[PDB]
Amino acid sequence: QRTLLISSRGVNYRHRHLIQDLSGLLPHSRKEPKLDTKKDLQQLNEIAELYNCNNVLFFEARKHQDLYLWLSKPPNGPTIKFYIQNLHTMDELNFTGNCLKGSRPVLSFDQRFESSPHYQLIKELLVHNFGVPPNARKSKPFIDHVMSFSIVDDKIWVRTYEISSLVEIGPRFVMTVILILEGSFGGPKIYENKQYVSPNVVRAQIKQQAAEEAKSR
Amino acid sequence: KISYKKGAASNRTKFVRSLVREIAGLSPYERRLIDLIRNSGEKRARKVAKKRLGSFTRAKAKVEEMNNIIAASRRH
Amino acid sequence: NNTKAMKHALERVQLPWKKHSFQEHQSVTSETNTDEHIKDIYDDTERELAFYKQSLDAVLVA
Amino acid sequence: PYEPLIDWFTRHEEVMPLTAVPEPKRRFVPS
Amino acid sequence: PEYVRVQRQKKILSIRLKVPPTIAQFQYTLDRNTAAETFKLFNKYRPETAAEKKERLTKEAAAVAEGKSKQDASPKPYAVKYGLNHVVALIENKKAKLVLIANDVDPIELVVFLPALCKKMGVPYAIVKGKARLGTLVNQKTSAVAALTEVRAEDEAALAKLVSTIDANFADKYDEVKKHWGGGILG
Amino acid sequence: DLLRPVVRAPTVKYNRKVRAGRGFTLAEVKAAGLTAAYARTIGIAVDHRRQNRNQEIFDANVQRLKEYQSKIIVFP
Amino acid sequence: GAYKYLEELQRKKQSDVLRFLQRVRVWEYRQKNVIHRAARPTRPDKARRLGYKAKQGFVIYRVRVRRRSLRATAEERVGRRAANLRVLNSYWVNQDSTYKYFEVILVDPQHKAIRRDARYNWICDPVHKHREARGLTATGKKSRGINK
RNA sequence: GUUUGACCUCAAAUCAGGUAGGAGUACCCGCUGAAAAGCGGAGGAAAAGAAACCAACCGGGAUUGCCUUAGUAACGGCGAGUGAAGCGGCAAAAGCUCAAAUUUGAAAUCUGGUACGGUGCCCGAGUUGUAAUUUGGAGAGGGCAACUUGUAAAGUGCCUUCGAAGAGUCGAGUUGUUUUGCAGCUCUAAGUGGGUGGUAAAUUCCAUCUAAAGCUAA
């Protein structure tokens, strides 16, 4: 398959380097310039139809703190929306190694992803996203570049490693599911995990508690 | 209250801009884009337009405007 | 409506097993043993160490 | 290259003026 | 001098390089006799000078002076009109039965729209050659435009026939060569 | 000092609190039966960018303007 | 009024006509000095919306600057050169790969027309002397970044 | 017509009238800038200043300064420590002017000179636009009605028709700098547009202003 990476007008440099590293990870992915609208999403399908890509990624950066992502097949029903948390960039010494950019990726599920059907969808569509055909450049050498996914309670910890035996090499993801809806980017909402709470609701709870305290005071 | 700048496009305005774009001609990237349309389709036309521009909405706007030019020129 | 459109998406998933370990994957049976006080990243990295070593054995074999 | 310019919109002639300004009083009475 | 050199160097590079067809619509201008009769027509419709205006004003004020004053009503004046935004104003009405456009204007973009504007509006525009002469017929140094709307009955037939004439000499002759790129020949 | 509107406060900490404002509106002074421009010469503050959205605040400041009009004697 | 047509014809700059005018006027100014006087504004619509009036006491200078901000520096050039004049504002007219060309509007506070006509007497006050030096012009405020 | 004259442009003035420098610089405003110095520019103050604002409310309403917000939010080998802002109380309170459509039934505008700040006369400047009127809070045209203050100016009720605005700019890529902004190079729009910010029971909603021009005491 061919893939696209799209970002929004929200920009923070620690947030930005993540997209660069991800683009370096997948060669079939692209680094098209960021879109204006965080609300209009159907046009992206046309972009995919213009770029001939079977899965497209859109990153929404709201308020320069909140990170959501969609990954979806652009002529096609599956659409899953995720929340992003606890990120780390290439600069620090957690990592201590680089790789030739484009070796075939190995992958791992530290979870059943069978009993829960929506998690099985997230599983298969992630395999789609990170499945790299032979067309990837610099794929002749195998760098032992591997990724793993781990639902802790409901948050997938997504991680990357290389051999030394092992050393971690790539970005650290604490990712959360939000919802699943039909169509390429529109079709009606089908599934939603109620356990997730957006940080907007959290600030609302804090502000409401402050208002109640002031009223009692 | 909504500013009168918000209301709509006056007839004088559409007239004026049509007359300006007539007398101006077509820029070399536009002179390119017409031939790229006629040769390799609106898909590649849109791709090249967006590469020239920054965003995609301006790209579709440009391609639609230039299709209007092509249609109103060749048939009339 | 959930499971039905989920099966719809399963059908829309074009992941055939025509080519084995070209996705190059190993799937785990159990979850990571993550005690909240323990440094759960390090509780992870040992288990994925195990599973990637398993995948390396699988790739070297086939 | 160079090509001649097409006159595709000039050839259409509008039969009315652009703006319907009401005529002022002062144009008909001595100043 | 520097500026004699510049002005002699000016008009060489413009013909050296290809002028856009929106330009060179200029200098494809009215012929000798037709401009001559256009100016003979206009010289009957000179505007009142400030001096003549003040003479008539003091005359009529003195007429009001008398005890035994005199009160009368007088007809409309007749004259060409010449101010640029005013000239465009009489267009888009329309009121200009004729418009003359000088070719030599240092900010030519002040005037590039006027030919196309009057073409689409159907005003019988003509490109006269020399803004200074427009200034002469209007009590100004320069005008760059000369519009006329209202004409007495004693010249109306002359106006209409001159309109047909300019339609014959300018619109017919030069529309196809208004329609090409000019210049481009080295000097 | 120039007389001012009694105005409602924003936010939730002081949603219950009432304040002195800048100026009433054009609409309110028209409801007073006088013009804003003339109302300036009398010493009444006026704010154009403000909007009246609460009925009770409006009515209270209207009665306030009535009593202001009552207590003032203007010299010719 | 015709000035609208000037505005929207200026809107399409890279068009054939205005690029041709750019390319002739850039050369014609190139023959001229770094700084010199223009008889009339080449973009009268821009001059008006920046505050121009065609009467005694309004001076037009064309300034050439090599590629602080370039517009602000260009304003400062005429600020030093014409000390008696007070800089009103400037605007862009033309450019080259070697130089950028700007047109600056200066006002004389000594001519009685400016001293009268209370619309513009405000610039006669000594506090407005060398606005460009203190960044009180349009580009000065933009570079300082003073807004709400 | 080899003449003469209209312009435009440019020079020259021991031609008329004005204007700049320099000192100081406690405070103020810009540029530069280390381990502050320096440069440029005033004034009695200066700057800023009447929202392309703040907010999510039962909304506020130029700017400026004080208390609080608060050593909080946020930032930081999240180490050294750095470090706000809405709102609220108070002081003082001020709003205005352009640029967009014609006065065309008369450039109505103004510098200068001269004879007695004003008046006359004359040169000029100016239509490549000076005056009057209109800055979105609308406003314009008329008609009717009355009022209120020389066929003078202005305010209000109703009918009809009109009802014009900041582009090498917004934005985007990249480079340098800065803590998001700024500066450079390539590119460059739109008008029931555009910018910013929330929002889904998502082929979403409604929320709020109008940049790319300018003045203004305390």
User: Is beta strand A155-163 parallel, antiparallel or unpaired with respect to A55-62?
Assistant: unpaired
- Return the closest-CA partner of residue E132 out of E108, E103, E90, E112: E103
Domain containing E10 — which CATH number? 3.30.1330.30
Residue with smallest Cα–C1' gap to H18: G110
* Chain G: closest CA distance from residue E143 (Å): 14
Task: Check D9 against B18: CB less than 8 A apart.
Answer: yes
Contact check, Cβ <8 Å, G6/E85: no
Kindly tell me the sign of the dihedral angle through the C-alpha atoms of E60, E63, E69, E73: negative
The DSSP symbol for G58 reads E
Distance between CA atoms of residues F48 and E93, nearest Å: 37
In B1-76, where does DSSP find H-type helix?
11-24, 28-52, 57-74
**Cα–Cα distance measured from residue E39 to residue B4, given in angstroms and rounded to the nearest whole number:** 46
Give the C-alpha separation, G115 to C11, whole Å: 84
E29/E15 Cα distance (integer angstroms)? 17
Residue A18 contacts residue A67 (beta carbons within 8 Å): no
Q: What is the 3-state secondary structure (H, E, C) of A168-180?
A: EEEEEEEEEEEEE
The partner residues of A68 in beta bridges, in order of sequence, read A60, A83
Distance in Å, alpha carbon of B40 to nearest chain G alpha carbon: 25
Strand partners for A85: A174
B20 touching G (Cβ < 8 Å): yes
The DSSP secondary-structure symbol of A128 reads H
- F contact chains, 3+ CB pairs < 8 A: A
Is the CB of E6 less than 8 angstroms away from the CB of G24? no
A92 touches chain B (CB under 8 A): no
Residue F28 tokens read as 């309110």
CA distance E123 to E134: 19
Domains, chain B, ranges and CATH?
Answer: 1-76 (1.10.10.1760)
Handedness of CA E132, E134, E138, E144 (dihedral sign): negative
- Cβ-Cβ contacts under 8 Å between E and G: the total is 53
With an 8 Å Cβ cutoff, is B52 touching chain A? no
Bridge partners, residue A72, by sequence: A56, A79
Q: Which residue has the tokens 């992870």?
A: C44
Interacting residues of F47 by C-beta distance below 8 A, sequence separation 6+ = F5, F21, F22, F23, F24, F25
Residues A180, A117 contacting (CB under 8 angstroms) = no
Which residues, 6 or more positions from D7, have their beta carbon under 8 angstroms from its beta carbon? B22, E179
Provide the H-helix boundaries in chain F: 26-31, 36-41, 55-71
**Nearest-angstrom CA–CA distance, G137 and E32:** 52
Choose among A78, A109, A159: nearest Cβ to C27: A109
User: Is the minimum CB–CB distance between A204 and chain F shorter than 8 Å?
Assistant: no
Nearest to C34 by CA among A151, A83, A170: A151
Chain H bases near protein Cβ (<7 Å): 6-11, 17-21, 29-32, 40-43, 45-63, 86-90, 93-112, 121-122, 124-131, 136-138, 140-143, 155-156, 161-169, 171-173, 179-205, 209-210, 212-216
G24 CA to chain E: closest CA distance, Å?
7
A211 and F CB contact within 8 Å: yes
Nucleotide H61's nearest residue (CA vs C1') is F50
| Token pair belonging to A208 | 């409401």
Q: Do chain D and A touch: 3 or more Cβ pairs under 8 angstroms?
A: no
Contact C51, C28 (CB under 8 A): yes
- Positive or negative torsion for Cα G124, G126, G127, G131: positive
Domains of chain G, each with CATH number or no CATH: 2-144 (3.40.1120.10)
Torsional sign, CA F13, F16, F22, F28? positive
**CB proximity list for G12: less than 8 A, separation 6 or greater:** B20, B21, B24, G18
**Contact (CB, 8 A) for A88 and A170:** no
CA A165 to chain centre: 27
How many C-beta atoms lie closer than 10 Å to residue D16's C-beta? 9
Strand stretches in A102-165, DSSP E: 107-109, 146-151, 155-163
Residue whose entry in the numeric block shows the structure tokens 């499945």: A131
Strand partners, A177: A82
Taking residue A160's Cβ as centre, other Cβ atoms within 10 Å add up to 20
Residue with tokens 């007008």: A9
Structural biology method used: cryo-EM
Name residues whose C-beta falls within 8 Å of residue E151's C-beta, 6 or more positions apart in sequence. E45, E78, E97, E159
Q: How far is the CA of G73 from the C1' of H95 (A)?
A: 34
E99 touches E163 (CB < 8 A)? no
Contacts of A193 (CB under 8 A, 6+ apart): A118, A154, A177, A178, A179
Pull the structure tokens for residue D16.
């009315």
Whether the CB of B25 is below 8 Å from some CB of chain E: the reply is: yes
Amino acid G74 reads: A
Report the C-alpha gap between G50 and C53 in whole angstroms: 72
C15 contacts A128? CB cut-off 8 A: yes
Domain that holds residue E95: 1-187
Q: Does C50 touch chain A (CB under 8 A)?
A: no
Touching subunits of B (3+ CB pairs, under 8 Å) are A, D, E, G
Cis peptide before A38 (omega within 30 of 0): no
> How close does chain A come to F7, measured CA to CA in Å?
20
The identity of residue A176, as a single letter, is T
Nucleotide closest in space to G1 (CA vs C1') = H101
Pick the residue of A208, A212, A213, A215 with the most F CBs within 10 A to test the interface with F by mutation: A215
**Amino acid, res. G79:** G
Of B43, B46, B55, the CB nearest to A35: B55
Given a contact cutoff of 8 angstroms between Cβ atoms, the answer to whether A145 and A168 are in contact is: no
Distances (CA, A) of G79 to A159, G52, G58, G84, G106: 62, 18, 15, 9, 9
**Whether E88 and G1 lie within 8 Å, measured CB to CB:** yes
Give the residue from F20, F23, F25 showing the smallest Cα distance to F6: F20
Tokens of E30: 């009215």
Do B and E touch, counting CB pairs below 8 Å (3 needed)? yes
Region at A3 (left for phi over 0; alpha for psi -120 to 50; beta for the rest)? beta
Across the interface, whether the CB atoms of A109 and C28 are under 8 A apart is answered yes
Domains of chain E: total: 1
F23-42 in b/e burial notation, b at 16+ Cβ within 10 A? Answer: bbbbebbebbeeebeebeee
Whose CA is closest to A13, among A94, A91, A70, A84?
A91
DSSP one-letter string for D1-31 = ---PPP-TTTTS--SS-S--PPPPGGGTS--
Q: Are A84 and A99 in contact (CB under 8 A)?
A: no
Residue ranges of the domains in chain C? Answer: 1-62
